[PDB]
CSV table of C-alpha atoms and ligand atoms in Angstrom, one decimal:
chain,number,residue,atom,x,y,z
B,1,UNK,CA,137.0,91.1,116.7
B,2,UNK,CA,133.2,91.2,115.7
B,3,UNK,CA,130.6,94.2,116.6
B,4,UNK,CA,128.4,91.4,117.0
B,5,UNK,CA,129.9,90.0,119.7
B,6,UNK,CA,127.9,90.5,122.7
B,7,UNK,CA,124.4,89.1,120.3
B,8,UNK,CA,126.8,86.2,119.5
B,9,UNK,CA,127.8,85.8,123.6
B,10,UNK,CA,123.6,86.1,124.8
B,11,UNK,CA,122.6,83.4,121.7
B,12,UNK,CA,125.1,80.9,123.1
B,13,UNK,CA,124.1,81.6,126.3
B,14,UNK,CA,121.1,80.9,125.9
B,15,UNK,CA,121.5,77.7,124.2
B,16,UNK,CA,124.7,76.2,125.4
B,17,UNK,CA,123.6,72.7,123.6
B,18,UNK,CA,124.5,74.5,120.4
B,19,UNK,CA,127.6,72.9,119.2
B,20,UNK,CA,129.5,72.8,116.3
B,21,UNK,CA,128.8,69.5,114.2
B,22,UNK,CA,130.2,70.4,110.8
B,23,UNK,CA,132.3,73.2,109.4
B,24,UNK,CA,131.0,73.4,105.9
B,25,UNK,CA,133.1,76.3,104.9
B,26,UNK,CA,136.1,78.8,105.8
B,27,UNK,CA,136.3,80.7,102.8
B,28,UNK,CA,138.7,83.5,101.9
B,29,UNK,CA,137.4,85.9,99.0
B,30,UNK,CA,137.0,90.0,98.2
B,31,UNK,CA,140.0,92.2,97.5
B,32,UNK,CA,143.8,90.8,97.5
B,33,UNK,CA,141.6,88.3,100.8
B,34,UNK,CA,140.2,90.6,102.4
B,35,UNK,CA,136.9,88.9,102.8
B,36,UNK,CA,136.4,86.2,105.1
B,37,UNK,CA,133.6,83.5,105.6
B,38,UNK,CA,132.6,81.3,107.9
B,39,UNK,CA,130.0,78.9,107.7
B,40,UNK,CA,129.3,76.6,110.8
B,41,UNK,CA,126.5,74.1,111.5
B,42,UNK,CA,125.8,73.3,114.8
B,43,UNK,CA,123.3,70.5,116.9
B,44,UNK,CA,122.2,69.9,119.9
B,45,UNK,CA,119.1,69.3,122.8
B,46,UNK,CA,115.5,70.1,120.7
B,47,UNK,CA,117.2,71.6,117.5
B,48,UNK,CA,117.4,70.0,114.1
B,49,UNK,CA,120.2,72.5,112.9
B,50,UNK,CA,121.7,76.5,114.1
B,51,UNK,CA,123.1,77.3,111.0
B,52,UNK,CA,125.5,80.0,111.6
B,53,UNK,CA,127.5,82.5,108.3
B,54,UNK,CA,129.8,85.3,109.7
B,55,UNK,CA,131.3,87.2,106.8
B,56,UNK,CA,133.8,90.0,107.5
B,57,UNK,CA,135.4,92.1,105.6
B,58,UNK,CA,137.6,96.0,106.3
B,59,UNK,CA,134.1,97.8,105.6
B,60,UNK,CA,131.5,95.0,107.1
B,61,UNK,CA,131.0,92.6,109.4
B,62,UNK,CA,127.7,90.3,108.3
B,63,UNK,CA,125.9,87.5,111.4
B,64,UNK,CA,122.9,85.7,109.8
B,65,UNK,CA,121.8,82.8,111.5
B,66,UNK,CA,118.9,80.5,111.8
B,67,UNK,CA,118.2,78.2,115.0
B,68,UNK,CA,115.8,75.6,113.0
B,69,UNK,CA,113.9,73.6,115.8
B,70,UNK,CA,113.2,70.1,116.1
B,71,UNK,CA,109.6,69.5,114.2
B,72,UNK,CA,106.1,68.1,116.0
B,73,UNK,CA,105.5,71.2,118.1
B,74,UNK,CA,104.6,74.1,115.0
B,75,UNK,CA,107.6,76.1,116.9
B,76,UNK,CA,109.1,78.9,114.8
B,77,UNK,CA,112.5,79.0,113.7
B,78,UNK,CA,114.6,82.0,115.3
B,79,UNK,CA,116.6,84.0,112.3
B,80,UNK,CA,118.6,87.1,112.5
B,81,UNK,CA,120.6,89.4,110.1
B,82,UNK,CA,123.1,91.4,111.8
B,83,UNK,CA,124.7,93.6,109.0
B,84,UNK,CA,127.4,96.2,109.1
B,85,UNK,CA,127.9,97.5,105.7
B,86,UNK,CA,130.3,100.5,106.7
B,87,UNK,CA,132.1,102.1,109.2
B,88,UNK,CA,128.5,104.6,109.3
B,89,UNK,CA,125.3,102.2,109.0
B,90,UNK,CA,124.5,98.9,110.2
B,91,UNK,CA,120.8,97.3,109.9
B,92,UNK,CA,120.0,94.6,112.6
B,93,UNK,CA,116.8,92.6,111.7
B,94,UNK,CA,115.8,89.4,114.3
B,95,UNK,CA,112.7,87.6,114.4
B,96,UNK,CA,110.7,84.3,114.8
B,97,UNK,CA,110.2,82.8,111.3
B,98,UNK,CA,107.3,80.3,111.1
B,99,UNK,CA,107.3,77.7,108.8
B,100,UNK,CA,103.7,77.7,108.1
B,101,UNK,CA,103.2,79.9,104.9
B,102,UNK,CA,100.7,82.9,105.2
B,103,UNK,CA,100.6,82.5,109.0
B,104,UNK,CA,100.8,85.3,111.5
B,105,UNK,CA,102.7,84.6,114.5
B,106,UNK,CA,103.4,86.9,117.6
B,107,UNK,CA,104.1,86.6,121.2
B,108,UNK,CA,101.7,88.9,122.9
B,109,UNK,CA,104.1,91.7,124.8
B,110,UNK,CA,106.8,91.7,122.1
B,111,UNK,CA,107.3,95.1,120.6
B,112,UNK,CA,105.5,94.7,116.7
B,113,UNK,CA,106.4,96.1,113.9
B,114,UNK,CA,106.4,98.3,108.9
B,115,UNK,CA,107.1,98.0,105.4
B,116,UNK,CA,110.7,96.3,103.9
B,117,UNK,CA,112.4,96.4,100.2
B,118,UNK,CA,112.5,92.6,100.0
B,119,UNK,CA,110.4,90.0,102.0
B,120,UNK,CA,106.4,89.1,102.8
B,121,UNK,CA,105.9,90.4,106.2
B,122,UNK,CA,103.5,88.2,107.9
B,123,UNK,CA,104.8,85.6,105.5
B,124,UNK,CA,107.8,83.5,107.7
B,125,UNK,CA,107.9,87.0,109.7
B,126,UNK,CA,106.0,87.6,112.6
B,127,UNK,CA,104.1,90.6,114.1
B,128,UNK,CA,107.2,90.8,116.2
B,129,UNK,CA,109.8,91.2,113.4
B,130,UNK,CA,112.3,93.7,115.3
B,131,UNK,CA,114.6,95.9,112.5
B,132,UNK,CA,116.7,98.7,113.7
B,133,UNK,CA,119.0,100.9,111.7
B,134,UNK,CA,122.3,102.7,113.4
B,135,UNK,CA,125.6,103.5,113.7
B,136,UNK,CA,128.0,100.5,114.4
B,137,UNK,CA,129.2,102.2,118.2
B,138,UNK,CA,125.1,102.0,118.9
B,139,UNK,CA,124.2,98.3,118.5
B,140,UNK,CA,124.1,97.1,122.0
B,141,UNK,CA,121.4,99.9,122.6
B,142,UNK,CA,119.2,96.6,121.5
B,143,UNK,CA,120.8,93.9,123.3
B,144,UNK,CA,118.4,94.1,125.9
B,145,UNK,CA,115.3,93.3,123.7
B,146,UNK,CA,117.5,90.7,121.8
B,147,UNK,CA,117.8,88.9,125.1
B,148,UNK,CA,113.8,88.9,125.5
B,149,UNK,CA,113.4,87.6,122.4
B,150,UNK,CA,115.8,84.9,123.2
B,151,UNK,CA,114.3,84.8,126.8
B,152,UNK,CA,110.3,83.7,125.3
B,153,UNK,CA,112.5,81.4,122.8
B,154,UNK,CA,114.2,79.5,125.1
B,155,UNK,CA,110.4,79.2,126.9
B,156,UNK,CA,109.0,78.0,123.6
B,157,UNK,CA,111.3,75.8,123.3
B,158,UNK,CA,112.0,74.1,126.9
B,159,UNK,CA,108.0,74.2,127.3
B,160,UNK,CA,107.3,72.3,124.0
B,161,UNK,CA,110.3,70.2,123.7
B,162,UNK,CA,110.2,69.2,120.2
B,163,UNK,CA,112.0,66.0,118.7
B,164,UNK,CA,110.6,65.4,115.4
B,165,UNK,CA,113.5,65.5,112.2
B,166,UNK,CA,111.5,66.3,109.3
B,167,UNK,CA,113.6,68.7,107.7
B,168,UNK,CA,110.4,68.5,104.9
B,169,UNK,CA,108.4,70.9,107.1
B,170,UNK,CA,111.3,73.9,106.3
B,171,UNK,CA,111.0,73.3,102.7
B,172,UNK,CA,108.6,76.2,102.5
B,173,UNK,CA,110.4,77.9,104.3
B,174,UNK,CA,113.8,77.7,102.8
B,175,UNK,CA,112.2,77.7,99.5
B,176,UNK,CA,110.6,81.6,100.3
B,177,UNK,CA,114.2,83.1,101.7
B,178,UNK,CA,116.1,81.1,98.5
B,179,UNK,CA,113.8,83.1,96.1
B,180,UNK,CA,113.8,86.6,98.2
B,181,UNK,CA,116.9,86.8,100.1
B,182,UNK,CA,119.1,89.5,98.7
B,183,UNK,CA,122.5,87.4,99.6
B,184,UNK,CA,123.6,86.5,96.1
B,185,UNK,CA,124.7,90.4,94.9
B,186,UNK,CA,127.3,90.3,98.3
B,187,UNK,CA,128.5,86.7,98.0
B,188,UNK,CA,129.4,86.4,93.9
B,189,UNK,CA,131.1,89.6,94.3
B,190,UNK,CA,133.0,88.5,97.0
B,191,UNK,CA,133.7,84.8,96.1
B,192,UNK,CA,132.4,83.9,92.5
B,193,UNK,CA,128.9,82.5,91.8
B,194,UNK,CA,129.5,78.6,91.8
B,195,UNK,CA,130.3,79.7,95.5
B,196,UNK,CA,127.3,81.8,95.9
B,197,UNK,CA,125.2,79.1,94.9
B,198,UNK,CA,126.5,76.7,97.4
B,199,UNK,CA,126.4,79.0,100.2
B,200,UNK,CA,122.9,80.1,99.1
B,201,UNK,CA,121.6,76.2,98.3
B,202,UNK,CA,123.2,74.2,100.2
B,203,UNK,CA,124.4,75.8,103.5
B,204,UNK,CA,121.5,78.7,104.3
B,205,UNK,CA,118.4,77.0,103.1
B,206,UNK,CA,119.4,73.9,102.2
B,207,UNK,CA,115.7,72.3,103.3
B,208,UNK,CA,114.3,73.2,99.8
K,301,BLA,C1,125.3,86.5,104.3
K,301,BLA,C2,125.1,87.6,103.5
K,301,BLA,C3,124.0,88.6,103.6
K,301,BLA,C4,123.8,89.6,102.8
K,301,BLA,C5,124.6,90.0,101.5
K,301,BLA,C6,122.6,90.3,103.2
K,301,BLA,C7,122.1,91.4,102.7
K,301,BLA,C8,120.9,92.2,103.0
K,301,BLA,N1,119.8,91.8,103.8
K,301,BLA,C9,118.9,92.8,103.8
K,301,BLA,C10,117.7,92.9,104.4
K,301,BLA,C11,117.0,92.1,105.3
K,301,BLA,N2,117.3,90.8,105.8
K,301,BLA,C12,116.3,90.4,106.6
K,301,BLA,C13,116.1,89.2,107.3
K,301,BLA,C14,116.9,88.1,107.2
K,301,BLA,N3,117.6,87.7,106.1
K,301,BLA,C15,118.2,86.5,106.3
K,301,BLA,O1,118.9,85.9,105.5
K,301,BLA,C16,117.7,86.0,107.6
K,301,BLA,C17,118.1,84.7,108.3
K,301,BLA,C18,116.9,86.9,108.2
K,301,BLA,C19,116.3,86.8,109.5
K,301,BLA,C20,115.7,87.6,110.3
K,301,BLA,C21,115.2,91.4,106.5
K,301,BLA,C22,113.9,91.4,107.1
K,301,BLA,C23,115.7,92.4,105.7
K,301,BLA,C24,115.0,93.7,105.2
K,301,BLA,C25,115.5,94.9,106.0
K,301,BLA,C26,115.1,96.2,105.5
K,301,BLA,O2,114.3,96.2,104.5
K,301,BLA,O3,115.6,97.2,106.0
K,301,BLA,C27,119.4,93.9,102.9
K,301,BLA,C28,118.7,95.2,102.6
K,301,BLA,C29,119.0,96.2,103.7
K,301,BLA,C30,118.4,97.5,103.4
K,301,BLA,O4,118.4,98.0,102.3
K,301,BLA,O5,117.9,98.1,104.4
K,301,BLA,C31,120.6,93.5,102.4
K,301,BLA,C32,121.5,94.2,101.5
K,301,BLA,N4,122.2,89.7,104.4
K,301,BLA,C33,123.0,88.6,104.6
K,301,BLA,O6,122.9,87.9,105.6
């Protein structure tokens, strides 16, 4: 049972080509475990990789994916966090992540964002970048705009139809969240730092 799970339902939706191609990890970690990840890699019609961690644990309940398109058509990727840290406050953040660096992107009717603790805005984050803070009984109040986001994705990419596979045009990219992404604190607690690394390295941004 996930508090994501009507985000997760609209994604798939959306993209029903989306399968599962590799497992690359189910992990049990935390308190004696109490922490559970999974790590899923999935392929499919005009993407190079959806990358998919769900961590859950009896306080939180963690979604971050990233839908990395096939290259040759300058489409951004589509990333979202969807973190529940406690039964009181959950933080969703979605947006479209370009892989051009220093390169404003937006979709003109969008809401736009607005300062953050830890990344470049305008940097891999567009003028779009939607980040909400709530309680977890609250989080479909943002569905709606979750499916219009998807909604102009989905256009982006059934208008462009990319096919290129050079994973080299992410390395940017990847390289930016590997150095800025505040993931490593949650995951060596939770399951030791070899493992961290891994997941960080190899799994999330593993285009580097
Ligand atoms: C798996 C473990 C995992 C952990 C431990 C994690 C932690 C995490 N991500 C955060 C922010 C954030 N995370 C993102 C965005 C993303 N980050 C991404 O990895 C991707 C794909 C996006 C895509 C949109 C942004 C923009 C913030 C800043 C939010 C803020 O400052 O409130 C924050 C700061 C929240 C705050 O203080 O308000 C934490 C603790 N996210 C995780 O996914």
């Amino acid at each position: 049972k996930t508090i994501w799970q009507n985000y997760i339902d609209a994604l798939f939706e959306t993209f029903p080509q989306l399968e599962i191609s590799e497992v690359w990890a189910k992990w049990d970690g935390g308190n004696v475990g109490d922490a559970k990840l999974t790590a899923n890699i999935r392929t499919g019609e005009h993407f190079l990789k959806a990358r998919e961690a769900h961590i859950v644990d009896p306080n939180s309940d963690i979604y971050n994916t990233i839908l990395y398109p096939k290259t040759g058509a300058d489409l951004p990727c589509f990333g979202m966090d969807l973190m529940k840290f406690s039964d009181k406050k959950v933080i969703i953040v979605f947006d479209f992540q370009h892989p051009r660096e220093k390169y404003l992107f937006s979709v003109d009717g969008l809401p736009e964002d607005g300062k953050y603790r830890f990344f470049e805005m305008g940097n891999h984050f567009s003028k779009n970048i939607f980040v909400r803070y709530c309680k977890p009984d609250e989080v479909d109040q943002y569905l709606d705009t979750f499916k219009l986001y998807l909604t102009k994705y989905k256009e982006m990419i059934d208008n462009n139809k990319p096919v290129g596979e050079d994973t080299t045009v992410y390395s940017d990219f990847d390289t930016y969240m590997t150095e800025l992404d505040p993931v490593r604190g949650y995951m060596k607690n939770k399951f030791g730092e070899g493992r961290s690394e891994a997941f960080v390295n190899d799994f999330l941004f593993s285009y580097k």
